[PDB]
Amino acid sequence: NIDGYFKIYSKHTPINLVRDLPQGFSALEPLVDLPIGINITRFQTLLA
Amino acid sequence: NCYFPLQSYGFQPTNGVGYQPYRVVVLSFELLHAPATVCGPKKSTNLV
Numbered sequence A: 001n002i003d004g005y006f007k008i009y010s011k012h013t014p015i016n017l018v019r020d021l022p023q024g025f026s027a028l029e030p031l032v033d034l035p036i037g038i039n040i041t042r043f044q045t046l047l048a
Numbered sequence B: 001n002c003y004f005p006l007q008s009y010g011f012q013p014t015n016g017v018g019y020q021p022y023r024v025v026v027l028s029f030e031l032l033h034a035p036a037t038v039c040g041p042k043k044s045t046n047l048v
């Protein structure tokens, strides 16, 4: 969140992994940028 | 000395130039205190 712009970068990859974050290297491409101007300080994730 | 505060405009097609109705738009704007979210058209020309 820089100068009012909320920027998202992301990646997907296929895995075959039991219960950990996998060792490897990835480059996240930017997917959207939002000129929202709001201050942020806190967050949560929403689950099914 | 009680008075109702409003009055209606006698707009008739026979009114003189002056007493005829005029439509007005004021394009009011406040400048350069937030990230730009309107601009004039950034004109373009042929690729050579």
Ligand SMILES: *[C@@H]1O[C@H](CO)[C@@H](O)[C@H](O)[C@H]1NC(C)=O
Binding pocket: A038, A039
């Ligand atoms: C954002 O936070 C800063 C510091 O807390 C403050 O100066 C600024 O006015 C805030 N902006 C808004 C839109 O709340």
